[PDB]
Amino acid sequence: TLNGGITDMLTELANFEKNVSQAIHKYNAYRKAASVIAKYPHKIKSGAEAKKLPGVGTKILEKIDEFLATGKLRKLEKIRQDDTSSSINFLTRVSGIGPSAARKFVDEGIKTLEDLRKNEDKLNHHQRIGLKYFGDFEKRIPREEMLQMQDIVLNEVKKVDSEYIATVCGSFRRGAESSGDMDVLLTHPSFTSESTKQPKLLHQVVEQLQKVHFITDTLSKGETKFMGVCQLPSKNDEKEYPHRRIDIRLIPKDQYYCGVLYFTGSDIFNKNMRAHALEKGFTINEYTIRPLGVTGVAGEPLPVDSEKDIFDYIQWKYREPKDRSE
DNA sequence: CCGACAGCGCATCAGC
């Protein structure tokens, strides 16, 4: 909140570069800048002060001086006024519509929520569901509701096979008082790095959650990753809860620590951590941490028996999930 | 000045 106006501005610029310019490096640069400023514990008085932070360079420094002087940025003011950019930006807020589809729809004169609804036949499945719950997916999930959803998912999973372990990750595991969605990491001893001893491991779980009407819709589904929609049950006479996004990722049981580090995030925390790993001569994914040879070619997986082990390898002090919200 | 910027699952398409 200390530098909320600045980080909002940068986020708006990031979104512009992603959705309209389709300049993903500019997008990621703006988000990095916004992140480093958000955790900076002083109210920023100048661009030069902000430029001391890594990730803030000359251009963002100048923007920050304008914003501090006047409370706005002319570049953003003009972007806001531009119909095509505003339209493109809006359409990407539908799950499954990205920068390319958004611009394509705008070209055909499909540029409002109303246009989308009347042109449902021109959407793929993911987009159609994204449009169906557009309102709901805008809403945050209070932590108290996340606790209920967790109870339901862990108990239902236990009913399918008591050897499943389901772990809620994402912002929830980072201790947030509200989340954008629910992220569930799933393991079963039958699925390891070495073998898949039984099939349908993800399916049976999804099927059980569909059976008790917790999962209501599917955006995408594969053997290890489910992306869909869920809803808490409501009591008699009470308004229904909003429909929520849910992600479920099944990871080899012996690779749980790399898996839970990944799915706990944040996304920018993962990006910084993995970038750092590279500078230290390692590569990290949701399965393994591996050394980089002289080549650049990845070596064999290093042994890992905790999240801290991964931090150790790259010479980072351990950071608790709650300090990983970047 | 220049190249690199994290790493990967699922849906959809062109080409064969």
Add this chain to the structure above:
DNA sequence: GCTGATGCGC
């Protein structure tokens, strides 16, 4: 049908 590129998502 398969393989690889592309889009969108985590």
Add this chain to the structure above:
DNA sequence: GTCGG
């Protein structure tokens, strides 16, 4: 857009 080398 930023930064290390």
